[PDB]
Amino acid sequence: KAAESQIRDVDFASESANYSKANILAQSGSYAMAQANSSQQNVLRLLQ
Amino acid sequence: KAAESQIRDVDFASESANYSKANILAQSGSYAMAQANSSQQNVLRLLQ
Numbered sequence: 001k002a003a004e005s006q007i008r009d010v011d012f013a014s015e016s017a018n019y020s021k022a023n024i025l026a027q028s029g030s031y032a033m034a035q036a037n038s039s040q041q042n043v044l045r046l047l048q
Numbered sequence: 049k050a051a052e053s054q055i056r057d058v059d060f061a062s063e064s065a066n067y068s069k070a071n072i073l074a075q076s077g078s079y080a081m082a083q084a085n086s087s088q089q090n091v092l093r094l095l096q
Contacts, residue, residue: 010064043060043061046061
């Protein structure tokens with residue numbers, strides 16, 4: 001029963017680290033997308 | 049998609065320059081046409 005646990009279950013020690021890392025990366029990626037969508041507003045200064 | 053954009057779309061950077069240049073040229077050409085039409089009034093001074 002212990003040898004099976006070694007294969008099947010997850011260790012919350014590492015799992016919470018992975019989750020927090022992925023969450024901060026999600027925030028960063030959302031900011032990057034929000035900036036990428038806006039990165040073209042400068043063209044209007046040419047046209048106006 | 050980016051490789052296609054490189055071939056198909058236009059860059060407003062250069063396009064606005066081309067457009068403004070052509071517009072100023074149009075104004076100058078219109079003035080030149082007006083002066084060309086008017087450049088014959090001086091004959092009347094002979095006849096009068």
